[PDB]
Amino acid sequence: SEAYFRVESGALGPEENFLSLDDILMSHEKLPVRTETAMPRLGAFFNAVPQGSKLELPLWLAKGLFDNKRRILSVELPKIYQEGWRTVFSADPNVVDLHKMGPHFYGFGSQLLHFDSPENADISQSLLQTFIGRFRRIMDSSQNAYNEDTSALVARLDEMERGLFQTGQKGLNDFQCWEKGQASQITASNLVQN
Amino acid sequence: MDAAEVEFLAEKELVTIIPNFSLDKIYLIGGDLGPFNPGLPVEVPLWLAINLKQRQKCRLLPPEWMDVEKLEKMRDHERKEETFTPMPSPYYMELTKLLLNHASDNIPKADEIRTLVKDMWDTRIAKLRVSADSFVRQQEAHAKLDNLTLMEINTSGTFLTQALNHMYKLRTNLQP
Amino acid sequence: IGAFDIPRFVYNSERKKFLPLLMTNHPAPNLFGTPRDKAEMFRERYTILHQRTHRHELFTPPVIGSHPDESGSKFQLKTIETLLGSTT
Amino acid sequence: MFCEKAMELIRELHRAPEGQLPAFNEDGLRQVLEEMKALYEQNQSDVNEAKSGGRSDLIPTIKFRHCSLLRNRRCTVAYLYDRLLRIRALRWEYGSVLPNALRFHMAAEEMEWFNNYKRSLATYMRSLGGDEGLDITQDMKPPKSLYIEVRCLKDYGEFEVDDGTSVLLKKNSQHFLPRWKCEQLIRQGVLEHILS
Amino acid sequence: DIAKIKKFSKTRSKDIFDQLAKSLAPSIHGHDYVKKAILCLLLGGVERDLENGSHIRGDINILLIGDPSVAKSQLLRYVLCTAPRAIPTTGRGSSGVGLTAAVTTDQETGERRLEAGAMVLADRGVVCIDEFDKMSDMDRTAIHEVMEQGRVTIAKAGIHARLNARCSVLAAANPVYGRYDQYKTPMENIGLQDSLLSRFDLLFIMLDQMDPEQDREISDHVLRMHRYRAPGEQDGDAMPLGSAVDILATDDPN
Numbered sequence: 001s002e003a004y005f006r007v008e009s010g011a012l013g014p015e016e017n018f019l020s021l022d023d024i025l026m027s028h029e030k031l032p033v034r035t036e037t038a039m040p041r042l043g044a045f046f047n048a049v050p051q052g053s054k055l056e057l058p059l060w061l062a063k064g065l066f067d068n069k070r071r072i073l074s075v076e077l078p079k080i081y082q083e084g085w086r087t088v089f090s091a092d093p094n095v096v097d098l099h100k101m102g103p104h105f106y107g108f109g110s111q112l113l114h115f116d117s118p119e120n121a122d123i124s125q126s127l128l129q130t131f132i133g134r135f136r137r138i139m140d141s142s143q144n145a146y147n148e149d150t151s152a153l154v155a156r157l158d159e160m161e162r163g164l165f166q167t168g169q170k171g172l173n174d175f176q177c178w179e180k181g182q183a184s185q186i187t188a189s190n191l192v193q194n
Numbered sequence: 195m196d197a198a199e200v201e202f203l204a205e206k207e208l209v210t211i212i213p214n215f216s217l218d219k220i221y222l223i224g225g226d227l228g229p230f231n232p233g234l235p236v237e238v239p240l241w242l243a244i245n246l247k248q249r250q251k252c253r254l255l256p257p258e259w260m261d262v263e264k265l266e267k268m269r270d271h272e273r274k275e276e277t278f279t280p281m282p283s284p285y286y287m288e289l290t291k292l293l294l295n296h297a298s299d300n301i302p303k304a305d306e307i308r309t310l311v312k313d314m315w316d317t318r319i320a321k322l323r324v325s326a327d328s329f330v331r332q333q334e335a336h337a338k339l340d341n342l343t344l345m346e347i348n349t350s351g352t353f354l355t356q357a358l359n360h361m362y363k364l365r366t367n368l369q370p
Numbered sequence: 371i372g373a374f375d376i377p378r379f380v381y382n383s384e385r386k387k388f389l390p391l392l393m394t395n396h397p398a399p400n401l402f403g404t405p406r407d408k409a410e411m412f413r414e415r416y417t418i419l420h421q422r423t424h425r426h427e428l429f430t431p432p433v434i435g436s437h438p439d440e441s442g443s444k445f446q447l448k449t450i451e452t453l454l455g456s457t458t
Numbered sequence: 459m460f461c462e463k464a465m466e467l468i469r470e471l472h473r474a475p476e477g478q479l480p481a482f483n484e485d486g487l488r489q490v491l492e493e494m495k496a497l498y499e500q501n502q503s504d505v506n507e508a509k510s511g512g513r514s515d516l517i518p519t520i521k522f523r524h525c526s527l528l529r530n531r532r533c534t535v536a537y538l539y540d541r542l543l544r545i546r547a548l549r550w551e552y553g554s555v556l557p558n559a560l561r562f563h564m565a566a567e568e569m570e571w572f573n574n575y576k577r578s579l580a581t582y583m584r585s586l587g588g589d590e591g592l593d594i595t596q597d598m599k600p601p602k603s604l605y606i607e608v609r610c611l612k613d614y615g616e617f618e619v620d621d622g623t624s625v626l627l628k629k630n631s632q633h634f635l636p637r638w639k640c641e642q643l644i645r646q647g648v649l650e651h652i653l654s
Numbered sequence: 655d656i657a658k659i660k661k662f663s664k665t666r667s668k669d670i671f672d673q674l675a676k677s678l679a680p681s682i683h684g685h686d687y688v689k690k691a692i693l694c695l696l697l698g699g700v701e702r703d704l705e706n707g708s709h710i711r712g713d714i715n716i717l718l719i720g721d722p723s724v725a726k727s728q729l730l731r732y733v734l735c736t737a738p739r740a741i742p743t744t745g746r747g748s749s750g751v752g753l754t755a756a757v758t759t760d761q762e763t764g765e766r767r768l769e770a771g772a773m774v775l776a777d778r779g780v781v782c783i784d785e786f787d788k789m790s791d792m793d794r795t796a797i798h799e800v801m802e803q804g805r806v807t808i809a810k811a812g813i814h815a816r817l818n819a820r821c822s823v824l825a826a827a828n829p830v831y832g833r834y835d836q837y838k839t840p841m842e843n844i845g846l847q848d849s850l851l852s853r854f855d856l857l858f859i860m861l862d863q864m865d866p867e868q869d870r871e872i873s874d875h876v877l878r879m880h881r882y883r884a885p886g887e888q889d890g891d892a893m894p895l896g897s898a899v900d901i902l903a904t905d906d907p908n
């Protein structure tokens with residue numbers, strides 16, 4: 001009942017959760033942009049940063065600086081969300097490696113939609129269809145890998161999918177422990193290790 | 195909800211025992227029981243029945259549905275139908291485990307009963323898997339699961355509900 | 371309070387704080403010191419002075435400081451192992 | 459680049475998903491606060507220059523540093539809050555008096571928060587019943603048998619079971635006792651429930 | 655497997671050759687002149703055929719003689735990784751037959767026929783010969799014809815033929831006695847005979863000078879390289895073994 005649970009990710013929603021460690025780590029990942037105005041003193045980090053300069057900076061910073069008329073900067077999509085990689089996902093979602101390409105693939109992609117890109121519709125449909133394609137294999141592997149090494153199953157899953165995988169594993173193990181009668185015993189908590 | 199909690203609710207179901215002790219009617223908060231007369235049947239909740247069996251104070255009788263022919267008919271009907279069929283108890287799996295683990299001596303043909311209940315469980319879990327896959331593939335927003343039992347739902351429902359929450363947000367992310 | 375009654379604290383460099391003798395894995399002081407203790411004497415004297423000095427005006431530039439901020443110069447300490455080679 | 463030091467705190471907590479509480483990162487918190495101080499001072503100088511001097515092109519840099527300040531605040535608050543979540547879980551997982559090796563991981567203010575939380579939870583539990591409250595820390599698992607057989611793991615002292623009666627919790631001794639009496643000691647690892 | 659970026663580069667840059675040469679192998683510090691020479695090897699000269707049938711090759715041949723752990727092998731591996739049709743070879747791993755051409759039987763038919771060796775495969779490309787001092791002289795007889803005339807002549811199977819082997823050679827060798835000896839002449843530190851050494855356009859001596867200044871900057875660079883990690887990879891990850899990660903017939907990011 002009263003176990004520890006972190007703040008849940010809100011990255012698929014309209015805005016991410018303020019206190020979510022997953023959302024913070026997701027928003028740290030870098031996004032390509034172009035500066036639409038010059039920025040004095042900023043050449044110390046990248047003298048001024050000149051106008052029209054290409055940069056890759058964190059998503060949190062890009063969301064802070066961005067506006068719908070692109071005064072400070074304008075945003076480019078990462079290549080995995082552009083039309084080339086969308087087609088690879090459309091081919092077969094089950095063979096791609098969203099741990100390499102993420103590890104927060106869906107959360108980062110959902111947060112890109114707030115930059116008013118012309119291909120927001122294509123991005124949204126791509127994310128939804130990637131999830132639909134990968135659902136059955138996530139379900140089967142999570143609910144039927146029992147008491148074995150799950151690293152091969154978990155390797156190519158993004159963090160959202162890995163969360164779902166652990167949920168399925170929890171259900172499987174709970175029912176199996178009940179069936180074997182191990183759910184009856186009263187046990188010392190996980191803090192008993194020290 | 196844990197499988198142990200599902201078992202806790204299954205433990206409220208009524209079963210018939212044959213006491214070897216004499217005791218007048220007892221007025222429990224959840225409803226009175228007894229009187230307990232030696233050698234005669236009396237109907238009591240499953241937790242009490244299992245406790246008395248463990249303390250050697252009664253003989254448990256199988257429920258009316260724990261019969262091999264009836265269970266074979268129900269199993270074949272389940273295997274033939276596409277939808278979940280009505281089950282002989284809303285906690286049939288939990289009932290089977292408790293009664294057969296604690297009272298196999300009292301219940302004849304317990305091996306056949308356990309295997310048939312296992313067959314029904316496998317068929318219905320396969321049907322539930324098909325339902326989940328169809329929901330996600332066809333992008334449903336609602337499903338009808340009339341004859342599923344609580345343990346059967348609880349085995350897969352947390353995973354399924356989390357997946358559907360993510361799917362809903364993914365298909366509504368363009369709303370503003 | 372006698373000198374032998376004084377409690378002992380060790381400066382953890384990677385936590386940048388003083389920890390009790392009961393919390394560290396350091397051995398307890400004894401009169402007949404070990405060879406390690408004789409070194410630890412002067413190493414600890416250096417340690418106290420080092421941590422104290424780095425928190426004075428000789429502190430970090432800072433790495434955020436830019437040039438218009440931090441237009442004035444500031445000292446930066448070096449250890450002896452650094453000054454050999456291209457630092458000549 | 460700014461806000462990199464803030465990520466170390468977040469990564470430290472994230473790479474222990476099991477819920478264990480690491481040592482409080484006092485110096486990391488200090489460093490991010492000093493970074494915020496430097497950011498704020500630079501922004502004060504720049505906004506004074508932009509307003510009094512009428513220099514307009516500094517505005518993007520003002521927004522840059524303000525966004526960085528907001529990020530550092532978010533990371534600090536999230537770190538402290540998740541540590542509070544773990545500490546809050548400890549009361550239910552283990553008990554009231556945390557082990558000393560774990561108390562050394564906590565900050566003094568974290569211990570103050572935990573003491574306030576313990577006091578408030580005790581008040582709430584005390585206010586539930588007609589008198590003597592309801593200890594909702596008990597009955598964490600559905601009840602099976604009224605009595606359980608337990609085995610002493612530690613050399614505890616004596617443990618009262620009735621008004622005038624107690625059991626000596628010497629190691630490897632086995633006692634048949636009420637579950638509601640033994641639950642907390644089993645949870646804390648003093649006793650082992652030995653039927654399955 | 656458009657031109658505007660390259661035109662802008664050649665017009666905007668001053669001594670683009672220097673920028674290209676120093677950008678050539680980033681993970682190896684120093685060796686600026688050797689990087690310039692390897693860039694010349696990559697670009698190649700121009701092939702000249704005269705009215706009398708006499709011929710001058712365009713390919714540039716480079717030999718590196720040097721002490722242990724002076725990045726000769728890593729320079730060769732860079733050229734293998736980046737040049738088109740760069741063929742790897744080592745002195746003890748190869749033979750003359752494997753260097754030039756072998757008789758094999760077509761499994762489809764059963765008839766004997768030629769199968770091209772490394773230097774024949776390297777035509778209009780590079781062959782990178784590491785451990786070149788460890789090679790046998792009988793094996794280097796083939797390299798003589800290939801470097802001199804850009805061909806290899808064979809008489810085997812049913813065929814007497816002149817195969818094209820117009821390849822640049824990037825050779826790496828250790829001096830005899832392992833480490834270069836200051837108190838011996840270069841022509842006896844170099845164990846190879848002058849007839850073979852005449853084939854190479856450039857011959858560089860690479861010495862592990864123990865100057866502390868160069869040691870400091872080299873060690874700084876090396877430790878920076880060893881601290882690098884790739885972007886799509888977590889801090890604790892061990893290096894994966896390969897798999898079929900290419901899942902479109904054409905490149906997706908570009």
Ligand SMILES: Nc1ncnc2c1ncn2[C@@H]1O[C@H](COP(=O)(O)OP(=O)(O)NP(=O)(O)O)[C@@H](O)[C@H]1O
Nearest residue numbers: 681682683721722723724725726727728828872876
């Ligand atoms: N100047 C340098 N800068 C960077 N790495 C270097 C340098 N010199 C040597 N190394 C490293 O040292 C290791 C050995 O280099 P290597 O390519 O074998 O040189 P080598 O002279 O060909 N060795 P050897 O075959 O015995 O002569 C590699 O990991 C190189 O990256």
Ligand SMILES: [Mg+2]
Nearest residue numbers: 726727784785
């Ligand atoms: Mg070598």
